[PDB]
């Protein structure tokens, strides 16, 4: 086509989706990770994670308002990945890298798994 | 903070949101523009448009599944702007610029209004 493109559009959309999340506006699911609960938008979760894409395209699970993750999932690891989904920013630290990598593998977030593997290999 | 950032993340999220729209997955509103209907995600509309941000933060309108736009709104102009919301790409042409600019003013999409004004001024 002969379209023009607004370079910052995708980043501005994501910034607004994060603002809606922070204000709990039109959030439609709560992700339960052991004792912790995280409110989010199903569409953002599906757009970032192979696991959520699978869950919310399922004819029964698409209608659930609560999703319980595997008890082995670390809440801080999930929190870091949820923030990444809504911001493109990953708070990767020596103290959380193993939990973040395990959570990203479970959530099927290939690019995160890739940078965790690379950061781990550099430290060995 | 000491975060790392994935450059293509925002663009990849938007590409997936557009894929969900094309497959009518978790769309939660229909925008009626005279004889035409457009299915979309309320969160994407709010993230792109001052008018939809206002509508869906309203305590009564947030729950509506159908929104009827002003009869003066051109369906093609709306279609072009809806595509832009989900892609960052604006199909701006001599034959649609007036309709696109009028629709962007109504929808409160300042960056679109700006490029339409600039393209019009260059042709006079």
């Amino acid at each position: 086509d002969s379209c023009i493109q607004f370079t910052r559009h995708a980043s501005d959309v994501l910034l607004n989706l994060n603002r809606l999340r922070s204000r709990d506006i039109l959030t439609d699911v709560v992700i339960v990770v052991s004792r912790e609960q995280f409110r989010a938008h199903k569409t953002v979760l599906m757009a970032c994670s192979g696991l959520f894409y699978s869950i919310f395209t399922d004819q029964l699970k698409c209608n659930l308002s609560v999703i319980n993750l595997d008890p082995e999932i670390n809440p801080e690891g999930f929190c870091i990945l949820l923030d990444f989904m809504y911001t493109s920013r990953l708070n990767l630290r020596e103290g959380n890298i193993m939990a973040v990598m395990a959570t990203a593998m479970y959530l099927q977030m290939e690019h995160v798994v890739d940078t965790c593997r690379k950061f781990i290999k550099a430290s060995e | 903070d000491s975060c790392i950032q994935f450059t293509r993340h925002a663009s990849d999220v938007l590409l997936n949101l557009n894929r969900l729209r094309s497959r009518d997955i978790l769309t939660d509103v229909v925008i009626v523009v005279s004889r035409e209907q457009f299915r979309a995600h309320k969160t994407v509309l709010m993230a792109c448009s001052g008018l939809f941000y206002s509508i869906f933060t309203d305590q009564l309108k947030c729950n509506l599944s159908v929104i009827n736009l002003d009869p003066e709104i051109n369906p093609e102009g709306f279609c072009i702007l809806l595509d832009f919301m989900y892609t960052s790409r604006l199909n701006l042409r001599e034959g649609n610029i007036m309709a696109v600019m009028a629709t962007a003013m109504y929808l409160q999409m300042e960056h679109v209004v700006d490029t339409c004004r600039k393209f019009i001024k260059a042709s006079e």
């Binding site: 379209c3 023009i4 607004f6 370079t7 | 604006l90 490029t115």
Partner: peptide, 4 residues
């Protein structure tokens, strides 16, 4: 705005 750019030519993509």
């Amino acid at each position: 705005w750019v030519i993509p």
